[PDB]
């Protein structure tokens, strides 16, 4: 385990997350316009897939915001990392989430895997790849939900479509079966 390596990788992860969330917000605007165009036509069951894409990306942007927050938290309390040998309570959440989410966002942010390495190679109490996955039952549940790979609720998709239609001056008749239940 190297400390300065972890510091540099944390700063890089922060910068990368900033860039990614910016450009993802922009792409989300453009793809929302695309969904509005799709709704202009009679194609409805396809706009639901497109808006699934959109809300997945939005969950992802929120999760990246949370991860940037946690990385900056670790970077603000880095000396408290170097001094102690076991992490305190103030850093349990950050370390846990940054180790749990690394394989999730490993493709988007590469340096995150190095951060996970330095945070797994520094600890031995319930640590190590195997024990690091075993002791991952203390991560932020909200971030787990944002990065949860699951079909979003249908009613949520209908609400997303209703709002986009209402904004882009396009008519849309929600599926009452899901819109009312």
């Amino acid at each position: 385990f190297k400390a300065e390596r972890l510091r540099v990788n944390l700063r890089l992860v922060i910068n990368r997350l900033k860039l990614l969330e910016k450009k993802k917000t922009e792409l989300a605007q453009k793809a929302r316009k695309e969904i509005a165009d799709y709704l202009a036509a009679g194609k409805d069951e396809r706009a639901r897939i497109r808006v699934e894409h959109i809300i997945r990306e939005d969950y992802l942007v929120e999760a990246m915001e949370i991860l940037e927050l946690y990385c900056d938290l670790l970077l603000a309390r880095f000396g408290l990392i170097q001094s102690m040998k076991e992490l305190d309570s103030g850093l349990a959440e950050s370390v846990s989430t940054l180790i749990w989410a690394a394989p999730r966002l490993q493709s988007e942010v590469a340096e995150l895997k190095i951060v996970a390495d330095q945070l797994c190679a520094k600890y031995s109490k319930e640590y190590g790849k195997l024990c690091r996955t075993n002791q991952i039952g203390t991560v932020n549940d909200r971030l787990m939900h944002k990065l949860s790979v699951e079909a979003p609720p249908k009613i949520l998709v209908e609400r997303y479509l209703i709002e986009i239609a209402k904004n882009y001056n396009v008519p849309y008749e929600p599926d009452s079966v899901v819109m009312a239940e």
Partner: peptide, 27 residues
């Protein structure tokens, strides 16, 4: 915005939401 300003200046015509979507995401 640039297109809107240029149109309005020329007098012719051409032929926010994120917060509501976030509030909806909070559920």
């Amino acid at each position: 915005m640039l297109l809107q300003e240029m149109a309005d200046e020329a007098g012719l015509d051409l032929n926010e939401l994120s917060q509501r979507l976030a509030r909806l995401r909070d559920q």
